Design an enzyme around this catalytic site. Sequence first.
Site, PDB file in Angstrom:
ATOM      1  N   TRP A  57       0.754  -1.409  -0.031  1.00  0.00           N
ATOM      2  CA  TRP A  57       0.012   0.004  -0.036  1.00  0.00           C
ATOM      3  C   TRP A  57       0.782   1.403   0.107  1.00  0.00           C
ATOM      4  O   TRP A  57       0.767   2.152  -0.879  1.00  0.00           O
ATOM      5  CB  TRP A  57      -0.892  -0.078   1.263  1.00  0.00           C
ATOM      6  CG  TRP A  57      -1.737   1.113   1.231  1.00  0.00           C
ATOM      7  CD1 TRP A  57      -1.734   2.338   1.972  1.00  0.00           C
ATOM      8  CD2 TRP A  57      -3.075   1.384   0.416  1.00  0.00           C
ATOM      9  NE1 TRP A  57      -2.488   3.297   1.754  1.00  0.00           N
ATOM     10  CE2 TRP A  57      -3.630   2.671   0.903  1.00  0.00           C
ATOM     11  CE3 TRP A  57      -3.860   0.482  -0.354  1.00  0.00           C
ATOM     12  CZ2 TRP A  57      -4.924   3.169   0.245  1.00  0.00           C
ATOM     13  CZ3 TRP A  57      -5.032   1.027  -1.057  1.00  0.00           C
ATOM     14  CH2 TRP A  57      -5.443   2.272  -0.620  1.00  0.00           C
ATOM     15  N   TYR A  58       1.732   1.406   0.808  1.00  0.00           N
ATOM     16  CA  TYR A  58       2.559   2.579   0.932  1.00  0.00           C
ATOM     17  C   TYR A  58       3.217   3.012  -0.372  1.00  0.00           C
ATOM     18  O   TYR A  58       3.126   4.083  -0.745  1.00  0.00           O
ATOM     19  CB  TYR A  58       3.585   2.166   1.941  1.00  0.00           C
ATOM     20  CG  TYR A  58       4.725   3.594   2.214  1.00  0.00           C
ATOM     21  CD1 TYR A  58       4.278   4.866   2.648  1.00  0.00           C
ATOM     22  CD2 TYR A  58       5.981   3.501   1.627  1.00  0.00           C
ATOM     23  CE1 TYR A  58       5.118   5.793   2.787  1.00  0.00           C
ATOM     24  CE2 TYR A  58       6.880   4.419   1.953  1.00  0.00           C
ATOM     25  CZ  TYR A  58       6.472   5.670   2.490  1.00  0.00           C
ATOM     26  OH  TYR A  58       7.284   6.870   2.492  1.00  0.00           O
ATOM     27  N   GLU A  79      -1.600  -1.884  -5.437  1.00  0.00           N
ATOM     28  CA  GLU A  79      -2.693  -1.661  -5.061  1.00  0.00           C
ATOM     29  C   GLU A  79      -3.337  -0.389  -5.326  1.00  0.00           C
ATOM     30  O   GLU A  79      -3.317   0.278  -4.641  1.00  0.00           O
ATOM     31  CB  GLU A  79      -2.684  -2.010  -3.305  1.00  0.00           C
ATOM     32  CG  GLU A  79      -1.922  -3.388  -2.782  1.00  0.00           C
ATOM     33  CD  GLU A  79      -1.603  -3.504  -1.474  1.00  0.00           C
ATOM     34  OE1 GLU A  79      -2.251  -2.853  -0.705  1.00  0.00           O
ATOM     35  OE2 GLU A  79      -1.056  -4.380  -1.240  1.00  0.00           O
TER      36      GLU A  79
END
EC number: 3.2.1.14
Length: 497
Positions: free
Chosen positions: A96-97, A143
């Site tokens: 995600w990051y 993502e």
Amino acid sequence: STRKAVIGYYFIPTNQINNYTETDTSVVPFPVSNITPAKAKQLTHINFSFLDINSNLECAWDPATNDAKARDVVNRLTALKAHNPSLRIMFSIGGWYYSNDLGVSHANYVNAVKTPAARTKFAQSCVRIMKDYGFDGVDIDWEYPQAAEVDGFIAALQEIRTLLNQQTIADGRQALPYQLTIAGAGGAFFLSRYYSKLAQIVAPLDYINLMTYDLAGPWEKITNHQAALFGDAAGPTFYNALREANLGWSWEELTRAFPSPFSLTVDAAVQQHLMMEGVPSAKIVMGVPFYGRAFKGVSGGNGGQYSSHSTPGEDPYPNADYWLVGCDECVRDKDPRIASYRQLEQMLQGNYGYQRLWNDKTKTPYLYHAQNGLFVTYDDAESFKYKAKYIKQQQLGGVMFWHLGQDNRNGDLLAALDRYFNAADYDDSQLDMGTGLRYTGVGPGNLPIMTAPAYVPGTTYAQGALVSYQGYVWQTKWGYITSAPGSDSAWLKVGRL
């Protein structure tokens, strides 16, 4: 039969790599030495996480990484293969990051897959990283690619697959061939980005690891279970975004596949994948969380379930009020909204005011703090009984979890999953899966077996009539119909013979 995959993430931030030590949990809470031989035997895959795509559009370590210390850490992981000849040390790109729509490296994901030449350079860099550091396969956790980026993403996966297969031949690795996986969306909103091309995405993969967790969180107005197996009619429901995907299906076909609103559950995500033609159950892996999500400011009435709440959603956590009573790891990590299973056990055992409750419809546990108004949704060895039985009943590929450091010290969650799949003296034939809401959608890829009288030319069929014809069971959408099933728009293919 075939062993179920058990895929555990090993996540280590760059500062812990650069200061790696196995003897100071204040520097590295979960060093590789905590993955004992017994735990290594219960895993089939460890996803080392996270690498990135850099501005050169190549797979790369965080440039702040000390390379010598990175190699030492990876070497400790691949040394575990001595205890398990089936074990693979994958590496994961993204997360995600790095790769979310607003993430620090997002444009690199978009650009790396955008052209044939970019895809060749990117794919080569993935396999080069794999070989240079000694990994056993490539896992991509973007993502998520948007609908317009999906064709490039598909071609990138296809190209990596070809290069991995070359590498398997070059290294004589047919007994443990290099693998390609992705972390896929576990909820319909993100899934809708690439859903229409799911079969193309899954074809080059050994597994698609569904992120069937984070289905609730502080970004939703109403507390909920983050990984309910089945639905609770008392809980929230969501619009089914899949019915707006570019599928080219008819109203009846869309309606039969995509009930809306629907319960956002693990079963929903699994069934949504199985509905698509060309997506085999054996490639679908169910993600489970080894952590709970905590909410504050909840009301009573139903143990904190389905309540309004006052949990900040921002990153970073916006103040120093670590209000999750007893969560010492939350103080360390400066965030009261996530608690490892490891910590949740201690919170329940201590004098901290929690009561562990069980939802018999979702088949998941939750903590309720009645005095302060706290709610925690998490999974445990009991919820994993139902999820493991579901994995076996639905003939899925196995289980994935985030992450290894959040299991308790003894590895009880991993040991439970291994037991439910592999222990000869474990018997779940009588485990009651309950009356929680099942996802009822049917698509081309999961037609149920049915019987019906053979279609008869010249007969006038009323609405809803069922006939068998040319291998399938068909239903009239209206009446009266006389056409042969499949020759026009009047018949819905509802089952297979």
